[PDB]
C-alpha cells in the first residue's frame, strides 16, 4: 500500500466498514513504536480525553500541544493542561485577524525512529466518533547513522518542506522538533507537503504556501493530457460577491494547473438531519447565515455527501479533500487530503494588485502525485495502483428542495435521527 491513506473508525456502522480504519488509540499504540515524546498540532483540544488516548505505559512521556488560542481560551487550555506535568504548550503566533491554527499533525518520536501523522481531526471525542475523517501515516523513519553523511531527503522534498513549515512558526519548542527531524531519514516519503502559514507573501515566496504552492507542484510534477476539479470541505469562507472574485479566478486556476467543471461537496440539511449524529453533526460544519446570504451563487456548485463506497454516507465529513478526476471519474491526476477548508483564510487571496498573497491561517496537507509513484494517473478504487477515494463518484447535485447546512439558523420542521430539533442560541 503506497498511499497510507486511512479513514478514522466510525462507531455504529458494520465492522467491515471499520476493517481498514484507524482510531487514535490505534495510531498511538505500542505496535506503532515505543514512544519517547510527541507533538500534537491542532485547533481544538480536550486535554483529558487526549491523554487517555495514549496507552497507559506512554501517558507520562512528554507531550507538546501546538495550538492558536488567545486570552481566556488560552487560559482555559493551560488550565486543562496543568494537572499533567508532562505536557507543554506552544502558542502559534496568529498576527493576522480571523486566522486559526488549523493544522492537524502528530510528530511521534520513538526509540526506533520517528513518525509523522497528518490528518483532519480535532483532538476531541466527537471528531473521532461518527465522522468521516482522513489520516496519512508516514513510514517509520529511521535515525541517521551517527557515523554517516546523508541528507535523509525524499524526491518530494518532504523533509526540507516540513522543516520550513515548522520554521515559519518561529517557536522555541518547535526548534527542538526541527532538530529531531534533521536527524532522521525521511527519504522513503512519496507525498508532497502543502502548507499554509499566516502572512503576506511577495515575489518568489508566493509559491511557498497555499494554493500557489499547489499550483507550483502541479506545474512542476504533473503533466497535461475537460477533467473536472473536485473540492470537498466542512467549512466555507466568504468567497466574494460572485464566482469571478476568487473561486473561479485564482482558486480554480491553481487547481486546474497541470504541467472545466467544478464540483463542490458540502453536506445538505438532509445529509445532516439523517446522519448518525443528527443535527449536532452541524456543530462541526460552521457555515453561517451571515456568510451564506452574501454568496447565494456558490450553492449551485454544491453537491451532496454520499459515501456508500466506504459505508459513511451517514458519517458527516470533517475530512477535506481536493482532486482531479477524469471525465468519467474512473481515474485521477492527483489527490490532496488536508486541513484546508474552502476559504481564502486557509488557501490565500491575492492582495495589492496581484503582487501579494495573503493567508490568515496555518493549514497542512499531503498531495499524492502519480509521478511520485512513477505513474501518470491513479485508477480510482470503486469500493473502499488504485487510490481509495472515500466518497462516491461522480458527486450528486443538490436537488431543488436541498439547502446547504447552515449552522446558526434553526431547523424545527422535521426531527433528526434522534428525534431532536436544532435551535442554536
Amino acid at each position: 500500500n503506497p498511499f497510507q491513506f486511512y479513514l478514522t473508525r466510525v462507531s455504529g456502522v458494520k465492522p467491515k466498514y471499520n476493517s481498514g480504519a484507524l482510531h487514535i488509540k490505534d495510531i498511538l499504540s505500542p505496535l506503532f513504536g515505543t514512544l519517547v515524546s510527541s507533538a500534537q498540532f491542532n485547533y481544538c483540544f480536550d486535554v483529558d480525553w487526549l491523554v487517555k488516548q495514549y496507552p497507559p505505559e506512554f501517558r507520562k512521556k512528554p507531550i507538546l500541544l501546538v495550538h492558536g488560542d488567545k486570552r481566556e481560551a488560552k487560559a482555559h487550555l493551560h488550565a486543562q493542561a496543568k494537572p499533567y506535568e508532562n505536557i507543554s504548550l506552544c502558542q502559534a503566533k496568529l498576527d493576522i485577524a480571523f486566522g486559526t491554527h488549523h493544522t492537524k499533525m502528530m510528530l511521534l518520536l520513538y526509540e526506533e525512529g520517528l513518525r509523522v501523522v497528518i490528518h483532519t481531526s480535532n483532538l476531541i471525542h466527537a471528531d473521532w466518533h461518527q465522522k468521516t475523517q482522513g489520516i496519512w501515516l508516514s513510514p517509520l523513519y529511521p535515525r541517521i547513522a551517527d557515523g554517516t553523511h546523508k541528507s535523509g531527503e525524499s524526491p518530494t522534498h518532504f523533509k526540507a518542506n516540513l522543516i520550513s513549515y515548522l520554521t515559519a512558526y518561529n517557536a522555541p519548542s518547535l526548534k527542538e522538533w526541527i532538530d529531531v527531524i534533521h536527524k532522521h531519514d525521511l527519504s522513503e516519503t512519496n507525498v508532497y507537503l502543502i502548507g499554509s502559514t499566516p502572512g503576506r507573501f511577495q515575489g518568489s515566496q508566493k509559491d511557498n504556501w497555499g494554493h500557489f504552492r499547489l499550483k507550483k507542484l502541479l506545474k512542476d510534477h504533473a503533466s497535461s493530457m475537460s477533467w473536472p476539479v473536485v473540492g470537498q470541505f466542512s467549512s466555507v469562507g466568504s468567497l466574494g460577491a460572485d464566482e469571478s472574485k476568487w473561486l473561479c479566478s485564482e482558486f480554480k486556476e491553481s487547481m486546474l494547473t497541470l504541467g472545466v467543471p467544478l464540483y463542490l461537496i458540502y453536506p445538505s440539511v438532509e445529509n445532516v438531519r439523517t446522519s448518525l449524529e443528527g443535527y449536532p453533526a452541524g456543530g462541526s460544519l460552521p457555515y453561517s447565515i451571515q456568510t451564506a446570504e452574501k454568496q447565494n451563487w456558490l450553492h449551485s456548485y454544491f453537491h451532496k455527501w454520499s459515501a456508500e463506497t466506504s459505508g459513511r454516507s451517514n458519517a458527516m465529513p470533517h475530512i477535506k479533500t481536493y482532486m482531479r478526476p477524469s471525465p468519467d471519474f474512473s481515474k485521477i491526476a492527483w489527490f490532496l487530503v488536508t486541513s484546508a477548508n474552502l476559504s481564502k483564510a486557509a488557501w490565500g487571496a491575492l492582495e495589492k494588485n496581484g503582487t501579494q498573497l495573503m493567508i490568515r491561517s496555518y493549514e497542512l496537507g499531503v498531495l499524492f502525485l502519480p509521478s511520485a509513484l512513477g505513474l501518470d494517473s491513479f485508477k480510482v478504487k470503486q469500493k473502499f495502483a488504485t487510490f481509495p477515494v472515500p466518497y462516491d463518484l461522480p458527486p450528486e447535485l443538490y436537488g431543488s428542495k436541498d439547502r446547504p447546512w447552515i449552522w446558526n439558523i434553526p431547523y424545527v420542521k422535521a426531527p433528526d435521527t434522534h428525534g431532536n430539533m436544532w435551535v442554536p442560541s
Binding site: 481544538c44 483540544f45 495550538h67 466527537a126 456543530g283
Partner: peptide, 5 residues
C-alpha cells in the same frame, strides 16, 4: 478550545 461553538 473544546469546539467551534
Amino acid at each position: 478550545k473544546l469546539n467551534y461553538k
